């Protein structure tokens, strides 16, 4: 479960997501608009990350590191399907 990995892992995973994206991820899985705002407003905090907020939130909801990969794969695979759609 995502909110239960060690800080280095979670921290490492979140900043990598902080460049791309977390709204697409969040959108692909589902978790609501107002749930996401807690996350969006993280950016106001000098060092803060919405992805960190998002992953912990996803963790709490019951997401494993294998469900996460399922999502990121789908994210990759629907980006192209989108890009080649009329």
Q: First-to-last CA distance in the chain?
A: 38
**Structure-token pair, residue 52:** 């960190």
For 1-86, the fitting CATH number among 1.10.533.10, 3.60.150.10, 2.102.10.10, 2.40.37.10 is: 1.10.533.10
- Rounded to the nearest 10°, the torsion over CA 85, 18, 70, 9 is 170
Reduced to 3 DSSP states, what percent helix, strand and coil does the chain have, rounded to the nearest 5? 75, 0, 25
> Using what technique was this structure determined?
X-ray
Q: What resolution does the deposited structure have, in angstroms? A: 2.7
Over its C-alpha atoms, the chain yields an Rg (Å, rounded) of 13
Q: Please give the DSSP secondary-structure letter assigned to residue 48.
A: -
Domain extent listing, the chain:
1-86
C-alpha distance from residue 11 to each of 33, 37, 77, 86 (Å): 23, 20, 25, 38
Q: How far apart are CA 22 and CA 28, in angstroms?
A: 10
Let me know if 73 is exposed, middle or buried by CB neighbors in 10 A (0-12, 13-18, 19+). exposed
């Amino acid at each position: 479960t995502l909110n239960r990995l060690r800080e280095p892992l979670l921290r490492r995973l979140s900043e990598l997501l902080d460049q791309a994206g977390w709204r697409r991820l969040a959108e692909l899985a589902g978790l609501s608009c107002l749930d996401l705002e807690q996350c969006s407003l993280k950016v106001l905090e000098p060092e803060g990350s919405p992805s960190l907020c998002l992953l912990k939130l996803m963790g709490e909801k019951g997401c494993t590191v294998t469900e996460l990969s399922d999502f990121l794969q789908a994210m990759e695979h629907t980006e192209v399907l989108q890009l080649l759609s009329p």
